[PDB]
Design an enzyme around this catalytic site. Structure first.
Site, PDB file in Angstrom:
ATOM      1  CG  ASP A  25     -47.816 -33.083  19.990  1.00  0.00           C
ATOM      2  OD1 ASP A  25     -47.924 -34.026  19.150  1.00  0.00           O
ATOM      3  OD2 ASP A  25     -46.657 -32.621  20.496  1.00  0.00           O
ATOM      4  CG  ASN A  37     -32.560 -40.743  15.872  1.00  0.00           C
ATOM      5  OD1 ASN A  37     -31.382 -40.567  15.549  1.00  0.00           O
ATOM      6  ND2 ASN A  37     -33.394 -39.704  15.981  1.00  0.00           N
ATOM      7  CG  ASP A  54     -41.877 -33.699  23.164  1.00  0.00           C
ATOM      8  OD1 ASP A  54     -42.943 -34.049  23.610  1.00  0.00           O
ATOM      9  OD2 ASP A  54     -41.145 -34.447  22.396  1.00  0.00           O
ATOM     10  NE  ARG A  91     -43.051 -35.411  26.128  1.00  0.00           N
ATOM     11  CZ  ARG A  91     -42.659 -36.633  25.715  1.00  0.00           C
ATOM     12  NH1 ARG A  91     -42.226 -37.544  26.568  1.00  0.00           N
ATOM     13  NH2 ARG A  91     -42.727 -36.945  24.400  1.00  0.00           N
ATOM     14  CG  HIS A 101     -48.413 -40.507  18.145  1.00  0.00           C
ATOM     15  ND1 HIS A 101     -47.483 -40.041  17.224  1.00  0.00           N
ATOM     16  CD2 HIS A 101     -47.815 -41.532  18.831  1.00  0.00           C
ATOM     17  CE1 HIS A 101     -46.367 -40.781  17.344  1.00  0.00           C
ATOM     18  NE2 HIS A 101     -46.532 -41.680  18.315  1.00  0.00           N
ATOM     19  CB  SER A 121     -38.828 -34.767  25.071  1.00  0.00           C
ATOM     20  OG  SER A 121     -40.125 -35.345  24.959  1.00  0.00           O
ATOM     21  CB  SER A 122     -33.063 -36.945  24.841  1.00  0.00           C
ATOM     22  OG  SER A 122     -32.951 -37.560  23.583  1.00  0.00           O
TER      23      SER A 122
HETATM   24  N1  LIG Z   1     -27.029 -35.907  25.833  1.00  0.00           N
HETATM   25  C1  LIG Z   1     -27.088 -35.763  24.584  1.00  0.00           C
HETATM   26  N2  LIG Z   1     -26.053 -35.259  23.851  1.00  0.00           N
HETATM   27  C2  LIG Z   1     -26.074 -35.071  22.498  1.00  0.00           C
HETATM   28  N3  LIG Z   1     -27.083 -35.340  21.704  1.00  0.00           N
HETATM   29  C3  LIG Z   1     -28.120 -35.825  22.375  1.00  0.00           C
HETATM   30  C4  LIG Z   1     -28.202 -36.043  23.732  1.00  0.00           C
HETATM   31  N4  LIG Z   1     -29.461 -36.538  24.049  1.00  0.00           N
HETATM   32  C5  LIG Z   1     -30.104 -36.594  22.881  1.00  0.00           C
HETATM   33  N5  LIG Z   1     -29.330 -36.195  21.838  1.00  0.00           N
HETATM   34  C6  LIG Z   1     -29.674 -36.164  20.434  1.00  0.00           C
HETATM   35  O1  LIG Z   1     -31.068 -36.430  20.278  1.00  0.00           O
HETATM   36  C7  LIG Z   1     -31.256 -37.663  19.481  1.00  0.00           C
HETATM   37  C8  LIG Z   1     -32.448 -38.478  19.996  1.00  0.00           C
HETATM   38  O2  LIG Z   1     -33.638 -37.786  19.599  1.00  0.00           O
HETATM   39  P1  LIG Z   1     -35.003 -38.598  19.600  1.00  0.00           P
HETATM   40  O3  LIG Z   1     -34.851 -39.773  18.671  1.00  0.00           O
HETATM   41  O4  LIG Z   1     -36.083 -37.642  19.163  1.00  0.00           O
HETATM   42  O5  LIG Z   1     -35.226 -39.132  21.067  1.00  0.00           O
HETATM   43  P2  LIG Z   1     -36.152 -38.673  22.249  1.00  0.00           P
HETATM   44  O6  LIG Z   1     -37.368 -39.709  22.306  1.00  0.00           O
HETATM   45  O7  LIG Z   1     -35.282 -38.846  23.443  1.00  0.00           O
HETATM   46  O8  LIG Z   1     -36.553 -37.224  22.031  1.00  0.00           O
HETATM   47  C9  LIG Z   1     -29.945 -38.414  19.679  1.00  0.00           C
HETATM   48  O9  LIG Z   1     -29.797 -39.376  18.634  1.00  0.00           O
HETATM   49  C10 LIG Z   1     -28.903 -37.275  19.732  1.00  0.00           C
HETATM   50  O10 LIG Z   1     -28.567 -36.885  18.395  1.00  0.00           O
HETATM   51  C1  LIG Z   2     -40.223 -32.953  18.803  1.00  0.00           C
HETATM   52  C2  LIG Z   2     -41.302 -34.002  18.538  1.00  0.00           C
HETATM   53  O1  LIG Z   2     -41.680 -34.197  17.371  1.00  0.00           O
HETATM   54  N1  LIG Z   2     -41.811 -34.710  19.569  1.00  0.00           N
HETATM   55  C3  LIG Z   2     -42.958 -35.564  19.378  1.00  0.00           C
HETATM   56  C4  LIG Z   2     -42.602 -37.049  19.785  1.00  0.00           C
HETATM   57  O2  LIG Z   2     -42.177 -37.161  21.057  1.00  0.00           O
HETATM   58  P1  LIG Z   2     -40.783 -37.855  21.564  1.00  0.00           P
HETATM   59  O3  LIG Z   2     -39.592 -37.564  20.505  1.00  0.00           O
HETATM   60  O4  LIG Z   2     -40.979 -39.311  21.951  1.00  0.00           O
HETATM   61  O5  LIG Z   2     -40.467 -37.165  22.951  1.00  0.00           O
HETATM   62  O6  LIG Z   2     -43.817 -37.803  19.737  1.00  0.00           O
HETATM   63  C5  LIG Z   2     -44.805 -37.338  20.676  1.00  0.00           C
HETATM   64  C6  LIG Z   2     -45.906 -38.404  20.670  1.00  0.00           C
HETATM   65  O7  LIG Z   2     -47.034 -37.960  21.458  1.00  0.00           O
HETATM   66  C7  LIG Z   2     -45.351 -35.961  20.163  1.00  0.00           C
HETATM   67  O8  LIG Z   2     -46.002 -36.044  18.876  1.00  0.00           O
HETATM   68  C8  LIG Z   2     -44.176 -34.944  20.124  1.00  0.00           C
HETATM   69  O9  LIG Z   2     -44.610 -33.715  19.540  1.00  0.00           O
HETATM   70 MG   LIG Z   3     -37.724 -36.386  20.269  1.00  0.00          MG
END
Ligand SMILES: Nc1ncnc2c1ncn2[C@@H]1O[C@H](COP(=O)(O)OP(=O)(O)O)[C@@H](O)[C@H]1O
Ligand SMILES: CC(=O)N[C@H]1[C@@H](OP(=O)(O)O)O[C@H](CO)[C@H](O)[C@@H]1O
Ligand SMILES: [Mg+2]
Ligand SMILES: [Cl-]
Ligand code: NA
Length: 446
Positions: free
Chosen positions: A51, A230, A187, A42, A49, A142-143
């Site tokens: 929620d 990350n 998310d 999304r 920052h 939000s991967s």
């Molecule tokens: N396609 C994918 N396959 C496996 N793990 C994934 C994938 N996409 C995301 N991840 C996991 O999610 C982590 C990224 O999470 P995060 O730092 O919170 O990033 P985001 O801002 O995309 O939510 C990656 O380091 C990996 O461990």
């Molecule tokens: C699972 C998690 O902690 N996601 C938090 C994180 O988002 P992202 O990992 O960038 O998608 O930062 C946003 C900033 O608005 C929110 O605080 C949200 O709740």
């Molecule tokens: Mg995340």
């Protein structure tokens, strides 16, 4: 409501992705998948920052998602694989999250764990799963949540039990925290609750999603800074959570509330019965602008350094010595107001709507950059370029410290924005137009 994630029939053949998933799954496990699950990532339009502070946000699902091919099995073994070799296969038969180190499969386990625990199940849900996510990772889209949510849905479906989209969201928001991040539920909420064609105002406690119609003459474009961040592997995120938590406690105390129970900035406002505008004034009076130190916080609250460290702060934050209470609170309260105003504008739809909406986004970016200090040089530079090229509004999206930007671009500027921005910063992966997509679903072959 009580509505559950839909189950839809697809023709694998028409979707390069599922086809691919199907074929790789068979080769990997020797059998075709029984079903698939998708959970999207999304883009947060505005409301960064907040929620976790308890305030309403305004995201929309993007098209990119986490897709998982599944086959239930009789053993109590979980075999996980990924279409991307960057993410190693993993297997477990465990009855009972490391959070010593953020391995990709632990996000899947957070999702599985939330579901199993919700039903008081001790045993591992047996299954074979092949994971394919196309959301750029660690980029604020939000991967991580898409994976947690998709894993939770997979688990539920394999269990044959029922949960509404709301409960799924609630459970996943708490379970993701096993990875070590102390974030909010935005998310996960949007991943389950999104509807194609509309953004949602997501409110918390209780969880509610409300349609928000975006301006008809502008388009949203995501541009990745390509600086990866990350959240689970660094402390930045949680320090902000703690600063907010501590600010809330000090505010409560200063207003003579029962601060010991207080965890969130919104609670203070709620308890006082005042407006957001008024909360900014309280903030101005209660919190000094210069930073707070642990001993000072401890003296203010009438607690011990040990209480603070072990009872309030999170492990990854116990040695923080500089707490920017004032700045964080100011960002929060002002940002929560901007979300409300953006929604109001979308509803009233004045003539100068795009312009006004744009200004709110720009104001959001500067508050994040200057007050929450969650931007970065690359993000700032990209945001400048977007604006230079036509964006009425542009700001970082998601947590920040790298990752994506979101721009609101007038329709007529669209084609040129894309080429110019590309040329300017990048010399469909990192830069692409988006639109409000639908939520998580269960997929069965047509
Ligand atoms: N396609 C994918 N396959 C496996 N793990 C994934 C994938 N996409 C995301 N991840 C996991 O999610 C982590 C990224 O999470 P995060 O730092 O919170 O990033 P985001 O801002 O995309 O939510 C990656 O380091 C990996 O461990
Ligand atoms: C699972 C998690 O902690 N996601 C938090 C994180 O988002 P992202 O990992 O960038 O998608 O930062 C946003 C900033 O608005 C929110 O605080 C949200 O709740
Ligand atoms: Mg995340
Ligand atoms: Cl990994
Ligand atoms: Na509420």
């Amino acid at each position: 409501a009580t509505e559950s994630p839909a189950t839809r029939r697809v023709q694998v053949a028409e979707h390069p992705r599922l086809l691919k998933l199907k074929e790789m799954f068979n080769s990997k496990f020797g059998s075709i998948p029984k079903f698939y699950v998708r959970a999207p990532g999304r883009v947060n339009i505005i409301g960064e920052h907040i929620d976790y502070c308890g305030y309403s946000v305004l995201p929309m699902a993007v098209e990119q998602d986490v897709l998982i091919a599944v086959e239930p099995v009789k053993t109590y073994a979980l075999q996980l694989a990924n279409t991307n070799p960057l993410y190693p296969d993993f297997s477990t038969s465990a009855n009972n999250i490391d959070k010593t180190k953020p391995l990709w499969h632990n996000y899947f386990l957070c999702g599985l764990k939330g579901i199993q625990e919700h039903f008081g199940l001790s045993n591992l849900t047996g299954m074979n799963c092949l994971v394919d996510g196309n959301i750029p990772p660690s980029s604020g889209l939000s991967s991580s949540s898409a994976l947690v949510c998709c894993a939770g849905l997979v688990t539920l479906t394999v269990l044959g039990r029922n949960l509404s989209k709301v409960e799924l969201a609630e459970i996943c928001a708490k379970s993701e925290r096993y990875i070590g991040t102390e974030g909010g539920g935005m998310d996960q909420s949007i991943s389950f609750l999104a509807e194609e064609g509309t953004a949602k105002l997501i409110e918390f406690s209780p969880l509610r999603a409300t349609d928000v119609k975006l301006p008809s003459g502008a388009v949203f474009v995501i541009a990745n800074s390509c600086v990866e961040m990350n959240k689970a592997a660094t402390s930045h995120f949680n320090i902000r959570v703690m600063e907010c938590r501590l600010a809330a406690k000090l505010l409560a105390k200063y207003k003579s509330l029962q601060w010991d129970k207080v965890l969130r900035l919104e609670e203070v406002q709620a308890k006082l019965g005042i407006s957001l505008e008024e909360m900014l004034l309280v903030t101005e009076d209660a919190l000094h602008p210069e930073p707070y130190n642990p001993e000072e916080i401890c003296r203010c609250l009438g607690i011990s350094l040990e209480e603070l460290r072990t009872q309030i702060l999170s492990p990854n934050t116990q040695d923080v010595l500089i707490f920017k209470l004032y700045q964080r609170a100011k960002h929060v309260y002002s940002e929560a107001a901007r979300v409300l105003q953006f929604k109001k504008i979308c509803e009233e739809a004045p003539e100068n709507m795009v312009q006004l909406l744009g200004e709110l986004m720009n104001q959001s970016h500067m508050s994040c950059r200057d007050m929450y200090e969650c931007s970065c040089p690359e993000l700032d530079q990209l945001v400048d370029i977007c604006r230079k090229f036509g964006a009425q509004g542009s700001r970082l999206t998601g947590a920040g410290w790298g990752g994506c930007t979101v721009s609101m671009v007038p329709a007529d500027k669209l084609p040129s924005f894309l080429a110019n921005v590309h040329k300017a910063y990048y010399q469909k992966q990192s830069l692409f137009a988006t639109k409000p997509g639908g939520g998580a679903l269960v997929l069965l072959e047509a």
